[PDB]
Amino acid sequence: GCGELVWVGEPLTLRTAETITGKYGVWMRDPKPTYPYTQETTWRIDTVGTDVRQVFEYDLISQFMQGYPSKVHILPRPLESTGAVVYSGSLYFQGAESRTVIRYELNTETVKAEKEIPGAGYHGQFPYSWGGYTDIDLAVDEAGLWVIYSTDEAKGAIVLSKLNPENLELEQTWETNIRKQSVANAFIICGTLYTVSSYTSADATVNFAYDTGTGISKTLTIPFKNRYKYSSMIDYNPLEKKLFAWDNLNMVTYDIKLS
Ligand SMILES: [Ca+2]
Ligand code: NA
């Protein structure tokens, strides 16, 4: 059931970090779970600092919400910022101080692929508006794995590329007219890129769309609430058909409706 985004619900807080290490971070579920994981498996990365390697894994939603991790993975290389995703059994993340995306297979704790995103700015060149070295933002939608970034050639405008999830080859690339540093974050639903206007406001909006199937850009005015005034991560999960976000220590989710 695909369509255009027409509504975002109120943010629901599922867990609150208890230390400054979790002021910003990323939390996610796999929209294509593979053994031994399930649709309930949740991963959480607290991303404050300069040597971020701990990935908290929870087998059950109850554990993610109330308990300790079931397992902690120590990444073999530090991770950059909040843009990572989990897809079909692998964590896809950006290496610290690099434009390299790394595929880390969770069940074997093995790096399976690495790829420099060609021409991508990194480490504060084309972050989202809050900073945080958010230059490179991975995304999963109904069609698979994507990466959101910018390049000098694009003059800081959002570029998005479809990625091969096995070897990280770029399969197709689109260039928008949206200055990446002018929006708070972005995500992809059914092949359409959406942006959020502000990371602090209770009265933000989903303010732009770019449809990769048609090439058409639109302006939107869909209300979006940053309940805690500092959203560092906003992603879409196509299995749950919900937004997952990290807002000033709080792991939150938003329902949506599509046309
Ligand atoms: Ca995002
Ligand atoms: Na992301």
UniProtKB/Swiss-Prot annotation:
Disulfide bridges in this chain: C2-C190
Effect on the protein of changing I256S: In GLC1A; uncertain significance
Outcome (variant: F126L): In GLC1A; uncertain significance
Effect of D137N: In GLC1A; uncertain significance
Result when mutating P31R: In GLC1A; uncertain significance
Effect of K180E: In GLC1A; heterozygote specific phenotype
Subcellular localization, as worded in the UniProt entry: Secreted
Phenotype upon changing I117N: In GLC1A; uncertain significance
Record domain Olfactomedin-like: where: 1-259
Result when mutating R29G: In GLC1A; uncertain significance
Reported effect, W43R: In GLC1A; uncertain significance
Record annotation: effect of changing V86M: Slightly decreased protein stability
Residues annotated for Ca(2+) binding in this entry: D137, N185, A186, I234, D235
Documented effect of changing P118S: In GLC1A; uncertain significance
Effect noted on mutating P238T: In GLC1A; uncertain significance
Recorded consequence of changing I102M: In GLC1A; uncertain significance
Consequence of substituting D137G: In GLC1A; uncertain significance
Protein's recorded name: Myocilin, C-terminal fragment
Parent-protein residues present: 244 to 502 of 504
